[PDB]
mmCIF file of N, CA and C in Angstrom:
data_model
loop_
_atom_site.group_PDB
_atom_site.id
_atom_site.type_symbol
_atom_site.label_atom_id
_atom_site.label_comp_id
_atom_site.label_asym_id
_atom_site.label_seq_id
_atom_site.Cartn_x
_atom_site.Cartn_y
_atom_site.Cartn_z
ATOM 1 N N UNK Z 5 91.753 110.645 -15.409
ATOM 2 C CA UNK Z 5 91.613 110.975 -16.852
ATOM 3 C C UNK Z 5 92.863 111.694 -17.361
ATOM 4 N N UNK Z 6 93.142 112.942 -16.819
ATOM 5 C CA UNK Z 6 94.317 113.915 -17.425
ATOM 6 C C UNK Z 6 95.179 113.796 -15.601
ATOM 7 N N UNK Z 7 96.363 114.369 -16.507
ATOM 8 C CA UNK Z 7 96.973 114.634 -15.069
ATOM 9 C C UNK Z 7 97.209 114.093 -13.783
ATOM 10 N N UNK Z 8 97.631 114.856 -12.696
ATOM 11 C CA UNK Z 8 97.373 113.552 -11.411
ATOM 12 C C UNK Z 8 96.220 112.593 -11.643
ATOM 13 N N UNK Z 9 95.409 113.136 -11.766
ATOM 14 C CA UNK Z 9 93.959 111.614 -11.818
ATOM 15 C C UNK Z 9 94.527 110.407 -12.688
ATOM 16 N N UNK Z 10 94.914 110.880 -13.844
ATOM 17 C CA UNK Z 10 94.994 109.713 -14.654
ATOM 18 C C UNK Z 10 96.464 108.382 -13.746
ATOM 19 N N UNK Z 11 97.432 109.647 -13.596
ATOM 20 C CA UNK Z 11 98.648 108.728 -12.392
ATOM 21 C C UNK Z 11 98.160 107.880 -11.288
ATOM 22 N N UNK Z 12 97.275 108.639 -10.997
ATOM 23 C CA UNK Z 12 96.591 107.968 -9.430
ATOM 24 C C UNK Z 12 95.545 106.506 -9.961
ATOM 25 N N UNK Z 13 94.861 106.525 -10.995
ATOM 26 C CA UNK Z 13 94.121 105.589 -11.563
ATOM 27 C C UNK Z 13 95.269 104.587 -12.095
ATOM 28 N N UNK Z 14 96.202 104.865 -12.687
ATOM 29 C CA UNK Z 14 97.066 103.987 -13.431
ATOM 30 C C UNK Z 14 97.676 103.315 -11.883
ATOM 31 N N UNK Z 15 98.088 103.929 -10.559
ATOM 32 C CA UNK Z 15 98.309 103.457 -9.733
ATOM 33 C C UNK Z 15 97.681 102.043 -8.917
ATOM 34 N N UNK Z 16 96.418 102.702 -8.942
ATOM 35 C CA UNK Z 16 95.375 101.488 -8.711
ATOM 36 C C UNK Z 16 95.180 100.478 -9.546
ATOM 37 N N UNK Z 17 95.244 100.433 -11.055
ATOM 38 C CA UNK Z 17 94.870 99.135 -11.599
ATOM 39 C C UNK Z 17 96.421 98.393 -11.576
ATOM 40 N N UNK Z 18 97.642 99.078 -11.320
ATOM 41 C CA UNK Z 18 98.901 98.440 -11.135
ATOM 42 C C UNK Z 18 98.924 97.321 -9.970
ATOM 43 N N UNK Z 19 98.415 98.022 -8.777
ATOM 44 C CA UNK Z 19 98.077 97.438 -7.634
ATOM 45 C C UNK Z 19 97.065 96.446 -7.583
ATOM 46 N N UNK Z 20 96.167 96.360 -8.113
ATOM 47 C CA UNK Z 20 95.117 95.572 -8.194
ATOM 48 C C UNK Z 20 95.505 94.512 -9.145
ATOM 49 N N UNK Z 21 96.568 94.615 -9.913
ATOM 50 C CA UNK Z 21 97.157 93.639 -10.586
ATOM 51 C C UNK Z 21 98.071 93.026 -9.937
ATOM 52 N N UNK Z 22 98.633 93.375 -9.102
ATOM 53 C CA UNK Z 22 99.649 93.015 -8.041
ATOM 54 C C UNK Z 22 98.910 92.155 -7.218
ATOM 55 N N UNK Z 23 97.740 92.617 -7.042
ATOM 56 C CA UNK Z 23 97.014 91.833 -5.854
ATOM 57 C C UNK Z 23 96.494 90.106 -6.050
ATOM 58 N N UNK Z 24 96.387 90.221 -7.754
ATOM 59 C CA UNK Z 24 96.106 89.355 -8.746
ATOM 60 C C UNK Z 24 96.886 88.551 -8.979
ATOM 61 N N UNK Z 25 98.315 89.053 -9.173
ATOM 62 C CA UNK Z 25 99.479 88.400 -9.931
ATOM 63 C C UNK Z 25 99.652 87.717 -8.064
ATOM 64 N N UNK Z 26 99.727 88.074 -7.063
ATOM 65 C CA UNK Z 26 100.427 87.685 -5.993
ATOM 66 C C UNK Z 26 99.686 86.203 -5.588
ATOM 67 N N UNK Z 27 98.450 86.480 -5.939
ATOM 68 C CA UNK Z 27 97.431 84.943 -5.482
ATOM 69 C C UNK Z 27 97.651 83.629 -6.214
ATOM 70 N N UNK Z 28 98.136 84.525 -7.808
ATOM 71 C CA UNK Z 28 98.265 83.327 -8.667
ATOM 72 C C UNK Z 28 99.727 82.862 -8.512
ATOM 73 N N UNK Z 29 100.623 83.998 -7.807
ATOM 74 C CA UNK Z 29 102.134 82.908 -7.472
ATOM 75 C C UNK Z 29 101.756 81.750 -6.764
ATOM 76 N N UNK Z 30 100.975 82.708 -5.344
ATOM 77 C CA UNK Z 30 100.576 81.446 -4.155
ATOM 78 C C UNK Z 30 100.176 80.274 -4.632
ATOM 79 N N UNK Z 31 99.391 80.486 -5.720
ATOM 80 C CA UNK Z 31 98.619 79.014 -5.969
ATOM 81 C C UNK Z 31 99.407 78.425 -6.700
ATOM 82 N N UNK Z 32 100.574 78.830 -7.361
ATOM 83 C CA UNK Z 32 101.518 78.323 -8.219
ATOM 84 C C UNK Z 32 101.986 77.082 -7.178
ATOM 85 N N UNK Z 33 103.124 77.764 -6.607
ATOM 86 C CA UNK Z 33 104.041 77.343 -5.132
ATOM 87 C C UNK Z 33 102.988 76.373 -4.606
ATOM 88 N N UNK Z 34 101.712 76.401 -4.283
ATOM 89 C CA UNK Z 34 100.790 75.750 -3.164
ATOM 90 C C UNK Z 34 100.486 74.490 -4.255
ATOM 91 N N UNK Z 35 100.492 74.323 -5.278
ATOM 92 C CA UNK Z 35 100.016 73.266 -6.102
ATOM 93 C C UNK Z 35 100.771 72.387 -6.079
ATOM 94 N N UNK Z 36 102.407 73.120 -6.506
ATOM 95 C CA UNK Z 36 103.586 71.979 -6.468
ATOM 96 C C UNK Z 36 103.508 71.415 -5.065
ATOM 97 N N UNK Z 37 103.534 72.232 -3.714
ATOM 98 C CA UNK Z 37 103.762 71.670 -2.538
ATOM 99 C C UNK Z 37 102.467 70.333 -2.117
ATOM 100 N N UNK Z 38 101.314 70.884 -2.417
ATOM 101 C CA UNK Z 38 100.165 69.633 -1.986
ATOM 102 C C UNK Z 38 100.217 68.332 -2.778
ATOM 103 N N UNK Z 39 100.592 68.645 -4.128
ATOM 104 C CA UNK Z 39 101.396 67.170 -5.025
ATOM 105 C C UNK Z 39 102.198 66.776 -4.143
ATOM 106 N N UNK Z 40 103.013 66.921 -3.762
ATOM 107 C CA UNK Z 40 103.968 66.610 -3.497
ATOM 108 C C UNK Z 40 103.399 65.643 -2.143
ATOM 109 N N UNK Z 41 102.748 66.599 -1.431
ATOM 110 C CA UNK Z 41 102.293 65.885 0.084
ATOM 111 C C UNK Z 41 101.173 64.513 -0.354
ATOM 112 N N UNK Z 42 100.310 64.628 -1.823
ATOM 113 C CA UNK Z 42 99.984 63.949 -1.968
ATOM 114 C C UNK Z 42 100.850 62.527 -1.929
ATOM 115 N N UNK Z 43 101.719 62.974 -2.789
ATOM 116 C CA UNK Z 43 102.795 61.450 -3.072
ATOM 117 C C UNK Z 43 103.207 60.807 -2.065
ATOM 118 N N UNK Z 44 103.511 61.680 -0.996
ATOM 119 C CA UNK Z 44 103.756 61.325 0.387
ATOM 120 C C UNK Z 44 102.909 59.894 0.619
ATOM 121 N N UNK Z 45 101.473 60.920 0.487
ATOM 122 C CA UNK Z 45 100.552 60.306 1.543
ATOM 123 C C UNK Z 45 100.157 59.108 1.088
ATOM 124 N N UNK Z 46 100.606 58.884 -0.516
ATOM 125 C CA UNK Z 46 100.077 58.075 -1.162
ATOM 126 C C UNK Z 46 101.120 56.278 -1.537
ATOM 127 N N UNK Z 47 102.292 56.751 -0.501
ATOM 128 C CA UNK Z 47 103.365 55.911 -0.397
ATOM 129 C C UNK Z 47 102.877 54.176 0.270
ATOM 130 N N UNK Z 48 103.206 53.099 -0.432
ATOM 131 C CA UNK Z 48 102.502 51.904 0.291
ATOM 132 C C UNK Z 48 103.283 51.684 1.639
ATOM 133 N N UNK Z 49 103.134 51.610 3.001
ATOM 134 C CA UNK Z 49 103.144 51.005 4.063
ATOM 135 C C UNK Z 49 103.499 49.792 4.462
ATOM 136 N N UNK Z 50 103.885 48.837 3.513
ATOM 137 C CA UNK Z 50 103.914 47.515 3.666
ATOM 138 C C UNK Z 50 105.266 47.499 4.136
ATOM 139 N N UNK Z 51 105.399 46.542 5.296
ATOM 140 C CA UNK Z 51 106.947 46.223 5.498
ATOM 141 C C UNK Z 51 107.769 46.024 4.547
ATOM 142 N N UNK Z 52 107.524 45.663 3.402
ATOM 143 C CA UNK Z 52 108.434 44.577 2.541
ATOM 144 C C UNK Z 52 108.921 46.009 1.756
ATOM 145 N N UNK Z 53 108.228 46.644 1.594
ATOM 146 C CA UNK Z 53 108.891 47.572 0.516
ATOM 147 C C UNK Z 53 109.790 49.258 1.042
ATOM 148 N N UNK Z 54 109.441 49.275 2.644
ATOM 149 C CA UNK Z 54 110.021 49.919 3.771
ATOM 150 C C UNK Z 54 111.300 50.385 3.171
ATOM 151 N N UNK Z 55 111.846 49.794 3.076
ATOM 152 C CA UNK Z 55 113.658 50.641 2.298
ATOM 153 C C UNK Z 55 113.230 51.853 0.953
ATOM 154 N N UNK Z 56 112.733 51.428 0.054
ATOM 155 C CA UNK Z 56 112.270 52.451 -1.169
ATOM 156 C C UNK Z 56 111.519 53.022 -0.711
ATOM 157 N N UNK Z 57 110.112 52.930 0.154
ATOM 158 C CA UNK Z 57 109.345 53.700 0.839
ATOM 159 C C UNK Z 57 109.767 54.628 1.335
ATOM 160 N N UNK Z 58 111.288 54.255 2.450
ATOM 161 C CA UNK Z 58 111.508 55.432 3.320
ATOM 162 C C UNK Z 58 112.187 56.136 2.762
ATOM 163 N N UNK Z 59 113.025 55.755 1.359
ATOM 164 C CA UNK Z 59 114.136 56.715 0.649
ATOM 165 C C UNK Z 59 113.581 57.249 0.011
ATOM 166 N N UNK Z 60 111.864 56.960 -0.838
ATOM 167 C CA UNK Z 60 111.451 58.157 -1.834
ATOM 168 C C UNK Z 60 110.834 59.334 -0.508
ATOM 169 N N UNK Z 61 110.110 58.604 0.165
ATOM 170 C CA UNK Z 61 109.675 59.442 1.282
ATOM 171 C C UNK Z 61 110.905 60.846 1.498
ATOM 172 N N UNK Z 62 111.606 60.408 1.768
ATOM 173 C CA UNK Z 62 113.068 61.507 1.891
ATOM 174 C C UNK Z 62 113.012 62.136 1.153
ATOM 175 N N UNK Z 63 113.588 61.441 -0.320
ATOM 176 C CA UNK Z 63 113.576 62.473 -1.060
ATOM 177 C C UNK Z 63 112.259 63.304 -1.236
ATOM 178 N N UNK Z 64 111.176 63.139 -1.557
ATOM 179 C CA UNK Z 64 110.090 64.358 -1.830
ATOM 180 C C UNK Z 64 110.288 65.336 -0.639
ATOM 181 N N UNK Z 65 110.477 64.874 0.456
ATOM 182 C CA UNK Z 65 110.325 65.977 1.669
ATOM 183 C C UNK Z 65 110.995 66.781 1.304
ATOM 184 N N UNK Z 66 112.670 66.133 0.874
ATOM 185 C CA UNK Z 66 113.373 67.596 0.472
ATOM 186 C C UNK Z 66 113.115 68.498 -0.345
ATOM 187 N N UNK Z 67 112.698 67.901 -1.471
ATOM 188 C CA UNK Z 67 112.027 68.673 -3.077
ATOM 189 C C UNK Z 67 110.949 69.593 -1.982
ATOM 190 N N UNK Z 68 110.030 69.514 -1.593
ATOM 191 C CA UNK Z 68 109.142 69.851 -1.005
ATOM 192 C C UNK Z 68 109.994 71.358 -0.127
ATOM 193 N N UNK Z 69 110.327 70.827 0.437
ATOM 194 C CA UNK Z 69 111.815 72.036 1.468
ATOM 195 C C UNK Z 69 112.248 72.863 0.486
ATOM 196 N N UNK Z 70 112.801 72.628 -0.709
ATOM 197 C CA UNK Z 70 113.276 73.401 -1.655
ATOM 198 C C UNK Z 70 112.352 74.332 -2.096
ATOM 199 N N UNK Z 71 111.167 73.814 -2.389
ATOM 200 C CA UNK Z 71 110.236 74.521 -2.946
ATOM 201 C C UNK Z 71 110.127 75.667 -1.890
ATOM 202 N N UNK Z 72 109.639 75.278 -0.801
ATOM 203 C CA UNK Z 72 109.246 76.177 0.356
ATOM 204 C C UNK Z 72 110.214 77.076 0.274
ATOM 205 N N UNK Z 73 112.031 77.068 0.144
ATOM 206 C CA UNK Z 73 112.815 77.482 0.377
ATOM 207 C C UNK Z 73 112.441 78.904 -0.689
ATOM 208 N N UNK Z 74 112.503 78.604 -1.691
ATOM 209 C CA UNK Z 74 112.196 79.328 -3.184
ATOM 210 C C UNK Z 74 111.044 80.321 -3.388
ATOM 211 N N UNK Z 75 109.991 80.009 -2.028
ATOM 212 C CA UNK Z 75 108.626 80.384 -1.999
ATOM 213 C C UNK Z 75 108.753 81.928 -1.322
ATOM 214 N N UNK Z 76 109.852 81.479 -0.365
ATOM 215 C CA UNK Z 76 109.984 82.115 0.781
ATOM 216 C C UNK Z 76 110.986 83.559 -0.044
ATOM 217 N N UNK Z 77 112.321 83.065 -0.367
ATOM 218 C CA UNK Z 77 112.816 84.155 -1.232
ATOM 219 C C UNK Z 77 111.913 84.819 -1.919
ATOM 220 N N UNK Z 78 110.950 84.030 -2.629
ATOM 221 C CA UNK Z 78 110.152 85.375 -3.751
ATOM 222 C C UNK Z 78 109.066 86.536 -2.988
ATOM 223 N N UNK Z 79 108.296 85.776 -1.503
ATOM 224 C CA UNK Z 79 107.263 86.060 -1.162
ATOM 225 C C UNK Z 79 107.252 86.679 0.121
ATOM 226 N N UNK Z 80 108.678 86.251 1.004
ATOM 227 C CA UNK Z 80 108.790 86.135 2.426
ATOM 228 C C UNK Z 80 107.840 85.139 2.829
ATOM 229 N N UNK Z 81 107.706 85.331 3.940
ATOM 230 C CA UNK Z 81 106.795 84.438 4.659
ATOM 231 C C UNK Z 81 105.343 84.608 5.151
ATOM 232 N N UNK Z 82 104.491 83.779 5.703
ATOM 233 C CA UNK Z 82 102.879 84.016 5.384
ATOM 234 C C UNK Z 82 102.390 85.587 6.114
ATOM 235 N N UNK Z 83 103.323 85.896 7.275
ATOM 236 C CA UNK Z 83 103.038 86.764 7.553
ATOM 237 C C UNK Z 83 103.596 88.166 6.765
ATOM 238 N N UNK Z 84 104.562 88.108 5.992
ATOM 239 C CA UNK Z 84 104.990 89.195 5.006
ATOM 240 C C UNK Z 84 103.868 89.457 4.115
ATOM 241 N N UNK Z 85 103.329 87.858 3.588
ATOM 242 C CA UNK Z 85 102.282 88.091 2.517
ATOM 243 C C UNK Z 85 101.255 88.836 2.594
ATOM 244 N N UNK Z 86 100.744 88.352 4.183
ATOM 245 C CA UNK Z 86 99.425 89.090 4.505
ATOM 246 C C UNK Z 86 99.626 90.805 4.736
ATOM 247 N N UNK Z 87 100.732 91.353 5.537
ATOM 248 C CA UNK Z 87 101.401 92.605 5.319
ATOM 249 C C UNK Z 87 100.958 92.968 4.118
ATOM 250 N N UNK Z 88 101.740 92.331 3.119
ATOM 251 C CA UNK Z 88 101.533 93.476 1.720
ATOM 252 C C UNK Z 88 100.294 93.876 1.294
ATOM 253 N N UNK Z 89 99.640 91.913 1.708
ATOM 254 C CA UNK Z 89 98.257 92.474 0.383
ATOM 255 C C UNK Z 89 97.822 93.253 1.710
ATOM 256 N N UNK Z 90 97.879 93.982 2.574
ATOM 257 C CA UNK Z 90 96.796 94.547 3.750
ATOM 258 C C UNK Z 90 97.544 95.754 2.720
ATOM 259 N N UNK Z 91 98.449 96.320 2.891
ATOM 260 C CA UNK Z 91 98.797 97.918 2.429
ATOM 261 C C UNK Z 91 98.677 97.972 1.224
ATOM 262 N N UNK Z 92 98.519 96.838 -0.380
ATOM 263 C CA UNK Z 92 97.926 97.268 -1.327
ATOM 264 C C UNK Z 92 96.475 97.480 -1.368
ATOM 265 N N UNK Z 93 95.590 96.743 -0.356
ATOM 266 C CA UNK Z 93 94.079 97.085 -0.343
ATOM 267 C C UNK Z 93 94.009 98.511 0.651
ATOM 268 N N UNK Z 94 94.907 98.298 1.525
ATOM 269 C CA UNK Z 94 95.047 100.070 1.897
ATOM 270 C C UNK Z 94 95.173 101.382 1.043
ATOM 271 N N UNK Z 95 96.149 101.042 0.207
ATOM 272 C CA UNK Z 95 96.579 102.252 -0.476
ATOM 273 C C UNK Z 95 95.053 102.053 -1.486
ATOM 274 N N UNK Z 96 94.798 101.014 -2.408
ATOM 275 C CA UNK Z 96 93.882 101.076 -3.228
ATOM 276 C C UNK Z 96 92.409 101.764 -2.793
ATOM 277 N N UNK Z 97 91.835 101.754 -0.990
ATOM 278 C CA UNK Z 97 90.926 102.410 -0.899
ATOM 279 C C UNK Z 97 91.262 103.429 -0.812
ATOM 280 N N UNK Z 98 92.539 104.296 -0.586
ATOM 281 C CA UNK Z 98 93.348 105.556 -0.022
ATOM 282 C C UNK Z 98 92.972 106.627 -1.548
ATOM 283 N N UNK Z 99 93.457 105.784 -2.626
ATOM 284 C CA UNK Z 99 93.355 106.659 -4.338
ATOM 285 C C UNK Z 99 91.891 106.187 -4.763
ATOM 286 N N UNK Z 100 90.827 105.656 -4.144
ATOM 287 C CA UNK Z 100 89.592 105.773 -4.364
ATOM 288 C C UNK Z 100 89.114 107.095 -3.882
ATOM 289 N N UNK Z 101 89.426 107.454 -2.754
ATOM 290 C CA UNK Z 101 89.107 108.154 -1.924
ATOM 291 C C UNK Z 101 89.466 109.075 -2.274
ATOM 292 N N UNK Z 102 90.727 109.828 -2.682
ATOM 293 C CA UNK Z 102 91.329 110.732 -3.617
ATOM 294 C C UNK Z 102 90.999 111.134 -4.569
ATOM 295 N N UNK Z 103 90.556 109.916 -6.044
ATOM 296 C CA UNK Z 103 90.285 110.424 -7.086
ATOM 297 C C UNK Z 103 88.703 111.068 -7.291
ATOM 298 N N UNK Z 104 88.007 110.573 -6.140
ATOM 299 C CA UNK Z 104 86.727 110.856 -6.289
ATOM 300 C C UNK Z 104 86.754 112.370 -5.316
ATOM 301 N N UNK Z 105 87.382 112.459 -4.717
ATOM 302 C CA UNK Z 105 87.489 113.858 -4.050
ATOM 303 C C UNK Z 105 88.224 115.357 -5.089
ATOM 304 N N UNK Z 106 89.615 114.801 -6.037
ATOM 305 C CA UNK Z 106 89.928 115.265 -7.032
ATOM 306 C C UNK Z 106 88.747 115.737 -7.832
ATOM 307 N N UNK Z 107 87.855 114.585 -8.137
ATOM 308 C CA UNK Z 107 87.442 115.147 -9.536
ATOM 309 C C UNK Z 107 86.306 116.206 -8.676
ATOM 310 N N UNK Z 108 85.862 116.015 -7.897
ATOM 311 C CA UNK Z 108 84.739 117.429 -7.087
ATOM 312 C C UNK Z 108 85.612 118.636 -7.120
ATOM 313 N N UNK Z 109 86.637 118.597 -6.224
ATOM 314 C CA UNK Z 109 87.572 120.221 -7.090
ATOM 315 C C UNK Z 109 87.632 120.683 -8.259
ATOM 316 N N UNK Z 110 87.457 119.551 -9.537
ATOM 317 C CA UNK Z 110 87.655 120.335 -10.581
ATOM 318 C C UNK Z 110 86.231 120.813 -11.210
ATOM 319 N N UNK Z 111 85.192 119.371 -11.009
ATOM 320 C CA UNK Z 111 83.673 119.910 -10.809
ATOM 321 C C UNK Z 111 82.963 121.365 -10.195
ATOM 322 N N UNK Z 112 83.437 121.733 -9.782
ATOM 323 C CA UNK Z 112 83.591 122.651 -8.661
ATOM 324 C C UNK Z 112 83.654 124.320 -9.464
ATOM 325 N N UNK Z 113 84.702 123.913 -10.308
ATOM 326 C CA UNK Z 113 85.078 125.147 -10.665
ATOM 327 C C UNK Z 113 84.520 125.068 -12.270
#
């Protein structure tokens, strides 16, 4: 409400927005990449057309690589991801735990 409490609350809904904003990158990045694998998968097989087959094939893989490449700069990698969101749901039960202990000290008196 006032004071540290109100910092420590503004902390948590920052974080909890973080936690929010981070799922909806993933699914950003993860949408372009499964299109993509779709097109793959969705390439015709026929001998006759084997030359354009195998050159679009190429190219998406790379687009696909790029993406990953781009994913990786913003996010690190799957195990960075899981790291963070573990220490923003850490810290977020940490200032639960705090603000409800705060406000009994001031209850208190």
């Amino acid at each position: 409400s006032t004071g540290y409490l109100e910092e420590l609350e503004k902390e948590r809904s920052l974080l909890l927005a973080d936690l929010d904003k981070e799922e909806k990158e993933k699914d950003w990045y993860y949408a372009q990449l499964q299109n993509l694998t779709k097109r793959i998968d969705s390439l015709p097989l026929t001998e006759n057309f084997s030359l354009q087959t195998d050159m679009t094939r190429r190219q998406l893989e790379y687009e696909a690589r790029q993406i990953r490449v781009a994913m990786e700069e913003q996010l690190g990698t799957c195990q960075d991801m899981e790291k963070r969101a573990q220490r923003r749901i850490a810290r977020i039960q940490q200032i639960e735990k705090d603000i409800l202990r705060i406000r009994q000290l001031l209850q208190s008196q």
